[PDB]
Write a structure and sequence with these properties.
This is part of a larger assembly, with 2 copies of chain A (about 290 residues), 2 copies of chain B, 2 copies of chain C (about 40 residues) and 3 copies of chain E (about 240 residues). By secondary structure, chain A is mostly beta strands. Chain A contains 3 helices and 10 strands. The two termini of chain A are about 50 Å apart. Chain E is mainly beta and about 240 residues long. Classes of the chains: A mainly beta (about 290), B alpha+beta (about 100), C little secondary structure (about 40), E mainly beta (about 240). The PDB classes it as virus.
């Protein structure tokens, strides 16, 4: 039954029980139900007025954290004879590349959220003169649409695309991307194939991809070269979450799939998730006095 | 607004905006098909609905195709205009399409 | 504080304290008498 | 079949039209791939002279 | 009085006398798509008893070294009966599922089977960067087998799979598991041939054991689609 | 009939129709009316409560985008022996030079709007020492009025002209220009000649030109040279739009006219706007399984 | 205002602007089987828009020496779409039929076609004591041809065939005929593969004629089943 | 009852019996300039029947390779009758226009004409950076011809020209098109000799065809100015 | 937020949901009975 829960539940005092027909510590796991045995029914308890809040484990709190989603270092220089991000990069936006955010989102099957995007930019002089206050353009391009192929390309005029101009000196750039799936929730996992033929990608519904982030330096190249690193942070907000999942246990291999190998030995090995102890009778951190 | 259904070589300019229909001597024949891909280049792209929609990424709702026969008063005929929901190949025989 | 015209621009919404853990802990229709289930 | 007179044209023309209905909606605005430039247009420099 | 159960759908019926209080996934029941959630505007076909009925799959043999079995829905049913025919002739489908899993043995047998319905069971492949292909995922009526049931073939864990709608067949206790599945998708309808909403997983957590003279102990899956709707009628894909 | 439309229309269920005299799928294109055939009248439909918003295709949303209208790079240096923008430029303001904004505005015949102007300024050292925080002056001069001819000219004292002083370090300069046409709307296209004789310009009503933007660097020249690039962005707002038009299909040639050539081959060629397929029976992206 | 007609069934629609006031056979309209007439006790499947929709047959060529064409119902439809699939998977069926027959030509053409729906058109064979066999009767979607349309291939007469539900396509007057058929059987339901309730007959009473340069003049039959019910679900016969 | 139409203006009248429900551009009707929109303070002359009457232009011949025809307004009328005399003697004018386009042929002819009124049809030139000159634009009563009607001589498209007020003359259906134009300008009045509010375009989308013995098929344009006002009286420009 | 003395200085006005598509889709005066138009 649905109810408003702001604090953990109280304990009532309980007394001696000796009743035929009533076995609250016995259960049937086979039904799929978790045991309903209360502590009052298992031991003799006191009255506890529990005032412990539950708000930090709200799904909103658990997922409205700015987490790193993209980190691109690129050279800011004259690029006449390079082979590589020539004063700009494109990034197909995904939540799969950095495993702390990925595992948290993969606790759920479906997520609906707005995405507050924060763009941190840092500069280093190539191996000193000072750090320039460069202007950057981050342009949101939808998935599969035409992205710029040059720093100076006329695609950056951005007639309808959202673009954000921002410094290095100023506070990171910040915008909110709305929940933009064509469905009512993103599919965190997708047991299916994106195309009507059979060559399409498994596990990737492109309905859940936000877009392309096209980031350039607006400035013409300086006579010396710089290395510019752009960090992108996503914070989900106004979150609804459905159908919780077993957490990822083995290390991630790819951003494209749930493929697994495991570590060489326990912990988090394919044959052994938990590290070993000597026997089932061995107490690993036994207090000995 | 006009679809460019006759988007073929040997079709020049305004010729692309009409489909020629001839008397046949075999029954149940295919006359033309129309891809419903607005995003790639097809007969729907340079339409009012096509051009405005390509300023957007997502779309929903019904379309309508209207076909004006421009033969003579004395010309007679019947056509069947079929929309096939996706999943398979485009129907090439009349007995498949009008399912 | 939210002076934007789009509602999704708002700050995070951390006041939904509604819970229904029985859709995960008791997804049967015979509510189990706390008495043997079987 | 198309069945015509000997004096009508034996080839006739259809014109196809398309519109959206009023249940139609569009979403997520983007730059149109129907227009582009690789250069400045002609006489664009004369706006600076 | 929760050990015995009859399930009547269409012309099909199933009786068991060793059930253990059926699972309704997330406390939900299958329903038709309401008007305030619908997208496809054509009038759907709702075949009801022609499709909402128990279809029994091919039984699999439970043996000593069995790793487990999986079937994907609606893929396992997409060639069966009038359900399969409606699936082939329509772009869109929607249904719930009533899953009944049967496994009996003697009172001298032991064994525990985890019978879990996994929504969006996106499979991983083992020890490669290459995603699973079409033939790895889409097994049809035969279903597949777990490669690594301990991590549910997706780098997570069997041990936490009880977060999903599930029952157990503990051979000492019960001989059948029943799971009622609602429509479970981000979209109100879906194309049946390229997406699988649910994966029925049946996993040997305690292996089959006896010291009696052995018998073939099969495991039988009966699945009734529930509240079937189909939209976008055309020719059959086949 | 005029009405308030916030969402796309619902669908009502419909049943079998077999009525003499009533043919809702038949139409007469010759009248110039678009077909009034409802889906309820063409197929058997369900009831759909449609909640899809229409607000992103409001003309205000469609055109209140900051779009690039001007991009001038000029040398900031001692200009005693140059031939070229000598620490300042004049720009006759127009919406014709950057084709993403131009095509959107040319969807309409008449536009009435205020213009929010944003001025982005970037600096590069000529081919390193650091980037200077230069002060710029953008002065609005009306069309045909006296513009400065020197960096140091006494025209920049700006006794009545609006001028904006702004840094490179600070957030781009931003002002709003009001709707300033002598008519109640700008003429996006003008089928006429501006003068009372016959040598005047075709297509150019000067009533629709905002003015001249006169942009200098206020600073005296440094001992080293810099290249300064000024980007001007216009966002129309409080927009009224009249008489929609066929979109531009061929590439633009000039900012002065609607002259056309088309590409060499399809797509967007003079003889072929849509790219070719093999026949009218050829399905170009046919699903084959 | 009875020359123009639109017929909308399911996802199918037909417009004509040269109709001539459609025939409702014996003044009846198709209905579902009511409870006070039902026999089979299982709950029927009523696929509605999946089956109650216009199916267009293969057109036949109208030529100078054509004797006529016939199609038997439901036999002509028993392999088409979801109707054919429901027929194959069910012992029993019941439906009405909406028949639309199309034939246009120029204003310089002449010709009269008798478009008649014949209930229980039990065919005779000519000049033999042997009854017509299975292949003579059951032609499927292609239909058959009249051997002796003057006696309706059963020793009666074409001239009295207007006692049956019928229309005419007189090429001077109209280009289409529409006949609405109710369920017409001694039993409330019937096995679809061994009995034909109705025979659509299309007979050249006045042959095609012109002195214009000739065209192929085809005749096209579109048939919508109406109020389809199916009982006795099992595997497909095929 | 929308095929027949009589248009009576001044001493002029036009009857057609093959119209197709006339176009009122943007749902508007021509009116005089109201006091709350006026600019010029002198009392205007409103000649009414002397100028608001049908003026028939020179007919053009519809042939196999015709690309189309255009006339600019008020330029085509600026030398005709009392309208032309009022235009020459006044700095300012204002009017609407009633356009009637006539093209008949036999019932064995085919052809489709797009009859579209284009507001502010700013013409482009083909394959040059040079803007069209005065003589390219200002053709007078004779009008001009489309160079590239597929892009409407301005790099846009014929296919999207139905966004403008338009009708069609489909020779099978109708023999006339009628378009009522309001005043369409950014200013309430305008100098008639240097600006054209409207361009009547008539474009062969389906070319003329028959296999009868040929006739000259002309296309005739009759234009009635509506609610003519004139301000700023002086000598004639001529 | 708008602390300027001129009204054109305001932010964009995105609340005009009035539409009349019939001036583009049906610019005749005989409203077409949805029945043949001709």
């Amino acid at each position: 039954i649905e109810s408003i829960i702001k604090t953990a539940t109280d304990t009532v005092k309980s007394e001696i029980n000796a009743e035929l027909g009533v076995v609250p510590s016995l259960n049937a796991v086979e039904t799929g139900a978790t045991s309903n045995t209360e502590p009052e029914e298992a031991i003799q308890t006191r009255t506890v007025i529990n005032q412990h809040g539950v708000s930090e484990t709200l799904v909103e709190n658990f997922l409205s954290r700015a987490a790193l989603v993209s980190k691109r270092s690129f050279e800011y220089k004259d690029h006449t004879s390079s082979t590589a991000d020539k004063n700009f990069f494109k990034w197909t936006i995904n939540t799969r590349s950095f495993v702390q955010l990925r595992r948290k989102l993969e606790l759920f099957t479906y997520l609906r959220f707005d995405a507050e995007i924060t763009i941190l930019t840092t500069v280093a002089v190539n191996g000193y003169v000072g750090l320039p206050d460069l202007t950057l353009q981050a342009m949101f391009v939808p998935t599969g649409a035409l992205t710029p192929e040059k720093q100076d390309s006329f695609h950056w005029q951005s007639g309808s695309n959202a673009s954000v101009f921002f410094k290095i000196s100023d506070p990171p750039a910040r915008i909110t991307i709305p929940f933009m799936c064509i469905n009512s929730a993103y599919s965190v996992f997708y047991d299916g194939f994106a195309g009507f033929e059979k060559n399409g990608l498994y596990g990737i519904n492109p309905a859940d991809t936000i877009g392309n982030l096209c980031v350039r330096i607006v400035n013409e190249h300086q006579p010396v070269g710089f290395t510019v690193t752009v960090r992108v942070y996503m914070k989900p907000k106004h979150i609804k979450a459905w159908a919780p999942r077993p957490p990822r246990t083995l290390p991630y291999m790819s951003i494209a799939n749930a493929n697994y190998k495991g570590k060489e030995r326990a912990p988090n090995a394919l044959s052994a998730i938990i590290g070993n102890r000597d026997s089932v009778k061995t107490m690993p951190h036994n207090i000995v006095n | 607004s006009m679809m460019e259904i006759n988007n073929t070589e040997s079709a020049v300019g305004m010729e692309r905006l009409k489909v020629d229909i001839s008397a046949l001597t075999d029954v149940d024949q295919l006359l033309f098909n129309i891809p419903l891909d607005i995003q790639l280049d097809g007969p729907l792209r340079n339409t009012l609905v096509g051009n405005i929609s390509r300023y957007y990424t997502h779309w929903s709702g019904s379309l309508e195709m209207t076909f004006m026969f421009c033969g003579s008063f004395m010309a007679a005929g019947k056509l069947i205009l079929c929309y096939t929901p996706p999943g398979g190949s485009c129907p090439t025989t009349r007995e498949t399409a009008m399912l | 504080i939210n002076f934007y015209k789009d509602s999704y621009a708002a700050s995070a919404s951390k006041q939904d304290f509604s819970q229904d853990p029985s859709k995960f802990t008791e997804p049967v229709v015979e509510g189990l008498k706390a008495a043997p289930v079987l | 079949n198309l069945i015509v007179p000997s004096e009508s044209s034996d080839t006739c023309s259809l014109i196809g039209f398309i519109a959206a209905k009023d249940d139609f909606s569009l979403r997520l605005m983007r730059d149109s791939p129907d227009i582009g430039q690789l250069d400045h247009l002609h006489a664009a420099e004369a706006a600076y002279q | 009085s929760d050990r015995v159960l009859q399930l009547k759908l269409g012309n099909s019926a199933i009786v068991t006398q060793e059930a253990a209080n059926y699972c309704c996934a997330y406390g939900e029941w299958p329903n038709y798509l309401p008007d305030h959630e619908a997208v496809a505007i054509d009038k759907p076909t709702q075949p009801e008893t022609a499709t909402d009925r128990f279809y029994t799959l091919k039984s699999v043999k439970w043996e000593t070294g069995s790793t487990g079995w999986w079937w994907k829905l609606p893929d396992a049913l997409n060639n069966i009966g009038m359900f399969g025919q409606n699936v082939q002739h329509h772009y869109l489908y929607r249904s719930g599922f009533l899953i009944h899993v049967q496994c009996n043995a003697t009172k001298f047998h032991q064994g525990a089977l985890l019978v879990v319905a996994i929504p969006e069971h996106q499979r991983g492949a083992h020890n490669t960067n290459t995603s699973p292909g079409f033939d790895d995922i889409m097994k049809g009526e035969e279903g597949g087998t777990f490669n690594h049931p301990y991590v549910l073939d997706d780098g997570t864990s069997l041990a936490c799979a009880t977060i999903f709608p599930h029952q157990w067949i503990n051979l000492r206790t019960n001989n059948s598991a029943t799971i009622v599945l609602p429509w479970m998708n981000a979209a109100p309808m879906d194309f049946p041939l390229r997406h699988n909403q649910w994966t029925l997983a049946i996993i040997p957590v305690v292996p089959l054991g006896t010291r009696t003279t052995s018998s073939m102990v099969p495991i039988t899956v009966s699945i009734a689609p529930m509240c079937c709707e189909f939209n976008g009628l055309r020719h059959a894909i086949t």
